[PDB]
Design a protein around this ligand. Sequence first.
Ligand SMILES: CC1(C)C(=O)Nc2ccc(-c3ccc(F)cc3)cc21
Ligand SMILES: CC1(C)C(=O)Nc2ccc(-c3ccc(F)cc3)cc21
Lengths: 546, 546
Amino acid sequence: TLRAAVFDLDGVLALPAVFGVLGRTEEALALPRGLLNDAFQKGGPEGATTRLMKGEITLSQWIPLMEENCRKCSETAKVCLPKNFSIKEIFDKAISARKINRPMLQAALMLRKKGFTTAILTNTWLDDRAERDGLAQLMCELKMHFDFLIESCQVGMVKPEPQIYKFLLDTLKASPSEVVFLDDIGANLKPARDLGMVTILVQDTDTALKELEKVTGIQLLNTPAPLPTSCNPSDMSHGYVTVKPRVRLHFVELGSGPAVCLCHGFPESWYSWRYQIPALAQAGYRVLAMDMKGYGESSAPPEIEEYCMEVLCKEMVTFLDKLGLSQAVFIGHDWGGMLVWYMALFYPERVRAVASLNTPFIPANPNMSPLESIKANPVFDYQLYFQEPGVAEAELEQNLSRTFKSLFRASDESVLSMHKVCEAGGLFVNSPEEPSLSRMVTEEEIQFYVQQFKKSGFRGPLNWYRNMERNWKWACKSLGRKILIPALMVTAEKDFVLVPQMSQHMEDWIPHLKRGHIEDCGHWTQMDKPTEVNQILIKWLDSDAR
Amino acid sequence: TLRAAVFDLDGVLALPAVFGVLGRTEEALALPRGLLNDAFQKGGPEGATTRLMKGEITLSQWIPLMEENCRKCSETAKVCLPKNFSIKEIFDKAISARKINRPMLQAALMLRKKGFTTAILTNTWLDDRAERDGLAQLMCELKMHFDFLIESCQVGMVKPEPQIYKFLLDTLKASPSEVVFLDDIGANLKPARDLGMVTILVQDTDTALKELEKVTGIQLLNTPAPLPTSCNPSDMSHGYVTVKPRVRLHFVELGSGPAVCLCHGFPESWYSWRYQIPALAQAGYRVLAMDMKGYGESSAPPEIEEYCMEVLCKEMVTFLDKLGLSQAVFIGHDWGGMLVWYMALFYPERVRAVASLNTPFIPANPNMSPLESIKANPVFDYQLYFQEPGVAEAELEQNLSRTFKSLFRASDESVLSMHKVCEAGGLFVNSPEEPSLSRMVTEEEIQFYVQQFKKSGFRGPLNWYRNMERNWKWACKSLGRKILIPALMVTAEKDFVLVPQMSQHMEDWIPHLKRGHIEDCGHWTQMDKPTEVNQILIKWLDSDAR
Ligand SMILES: CC1(C)C(=O)Nc2ccc(-c3ccc(F)cc3)cc21
Ligand SMILES: CC1(C)C(=O)Nc2ccc(-c3ccc(F)cc3)cc21
């Protein structure tokens, strides 16, 4: 029975094959057929290309040897290479044109999800070209999804030599009959076949994937749209910044490029952005996913006033100061969404661009108490239940697994009576002790939130709602301002509290505001509709956040 | 007696004054004298500029009000503003031309070093211009050097109103007679003077600094060249990445831009780069200063093989993978310098550029054992003392303060007999029990290293020298390669072990190698000559690392 799948890089996980450019160049330049492919393989196991693939020499040392071989081949075929012939140019274009073969990666991802050990086995080179970063980027994106990456130039062995196959089996800790090996070169399949491995000659991806599903008995073709890549907490870079004597802020960091600071809502974590972090980093951004003050590995002081917007915003500015960041793009959800609008209003010089999921920008009404304003809308009643210190903490901390399983549910799975919370005596009075697992989350994802909330509980997080008068007084100072920096408002059709219509007047205060809208999306936006959140955010980032 | 110094921003800590552009524009456009300055102050305390400075409105809301005032003033003076007159253009140019007044900052730095509480008190605005980042950058660089930053637009008060002065005194927790107040506007000095504060009207910096030194009794003018800004460990962003089950890597992070990964030597810390971190971040780079494997907050497994170059390099690649970085510039010193050359040789696709301080690149000699090669040079004898597990650990761990005070000394303070270590029975046999403090370090800086080494000791750090045969075998695989990516070699005149002449053949293997050289520099390069290290690295980064 199969328990391992091995994939080649060129012509299998990455298309078009770099090899096939030797043929295309021949046709474009009207050179004798196979001339470039002949000079490429010249000398066979003793040749320049084999030395390159074994790591004896670098790609830049190989370029003049290939040119020298191209001349000798043309001299024999009684032909002349054009005025401006360049192996460097040919390969630079070929390498940058090569992209990930998405359905092949999807199949490898699906096999690994079903318990398979996966690996990339490739005949490759040590790339020291001025433009080597393009290929470094491709290898980084691909390799993360596999258990092993075996590169000929690092191991000093090359396919079709029998030793590399014995090396692969030792790395996999598997018998050859347990292995599927996919390659676009028949000669390179041959030793794997002769050893007893199942082999697939890859020409078109579709036929290769049909052969792959028939032999594994796992559906890989025509399968539903996969979720974006998530985060394994133990594999992330974890950062810690002391913003003041008793306050440290924790964040997870991924990628290079303009800093994108992600600000979760209540009662969440950096992990609420798990489906956005790999996507935004891959789109060319340096993601900083916060544990907001009161949460996870960040400090959680008990004082209510430690959680007013003025204090929270000041601390986020210090967070940027200590990291040496002059600016960051601020993206928030729920309470994080409220914080990001006030970062834009009070510190525009520090905010590259601002985006909010669900949370509209509504200015303070200076002729009405915030307590009065909130009583007007019956959907905001649950926030009055949060006012009395200790009441909501006791119910939310009682059973953590029940708390998160009850809260994190899609719009058509809701188990909560949001009205009338105070009167009913609690959020979960008509809710089960053992809620069923929502289709949005796994048991393990719930257990991550449970473990995070074991440290500081719900006091600090609930304190965010306990500064309505302080926040109102501070917000009134901004009543003559407008938000004029790049801004995005993302509405969720089925958020029954932060309703899309509440954002309707925003253009009066943010004239150049851009919008996104997600149909059939509840309150837990990032995990409810991750693919669409990523599409909207990446599109807005590339256009407005530089 | 004075214990606090307060500085204005425009015309005092930053020059040329943004105000003075109103006058220059008048002269350039041949407009009536004081016309632009009149429309700027139009309406006085009730005017548009006062509302701006109090934070009632943003800079972009103010621009059309200023234009409207400029028209009314021109209509009265019976003049016509030119075809293409733009307040936006005038102020964009004025703000970007304004730079830090270096000698004024140096004086504030010197006063704070002598126990003074320092603050910036400024009449400023909420900047929402498309080009606001330039000013955000300036405020970030300046503010870090002061105890307090009081901005009119954040406090809703403005100079010369008496309330802002009472607010300043409350923030300083000082009586007015204890305060020196420096301002370029006479009207703004007046309430501070009337309260009993010492006031300096700032026209030219030199005269202002003479007045400042006469009143404080502290030399501020003609004082020696200051050291670059250092790091306070508790104020840095601390990052943590698990590279494998038993191995976590710690780093300090500062700045935005291309990632620059700093790799210390033996027996050091991320803190050895304390004078480079703020400088490189200010030059436009994202600095990642490592605690290398075996050190500080990074894991220190006991096995010798955990510290061979192959393992260390692989882990540094995983470190980049987990952070989502496709590349980084690698800068190393001593053992870190050796690691960076092999990162360039084995992983060029992941290395944006490579630089080494003191450590030359010398290829493996495949016809000689590394143990033989090292015996040939008597300066490398101390490395043989490091071979036997437990011997060097015992002497180095015996008295940590003695260890670091003995090691970290300039070329003309050396206390160590580097020959013949093994024969003499130790590094510190002819060294004092209580070494005098080197001119390069403070007691507090030594105590930081002492506290760091209390965690894991010297086993992991010494293990870096215990893989000579393993490293030699791995290095021989690279003998046919060349380093062709951007590279910098920095030599230290007085490093008696890693001598400048040892780097002489490097061009044979790195043909496009760039060089730097530091005269009168010992082995502890970063702390011995910080200003010159920063100049060489910043110059090479801006030219070759993009
Ligand atoms: C799902 C539902 C109704 C919706 O449609 N919008 C919101 C907003 C907040 C909460 C919420 C958050 C925390 C908590 F403890 C209780 C309820 C729940 C919801
Ligand atoms: C200062 C001096 C001689 C010099 O000029 N070059 C070097 C290189 C290494 C060490 C050193 C490092 C660690 C240790 F434990 C002992 C000596 C000491 C030196």
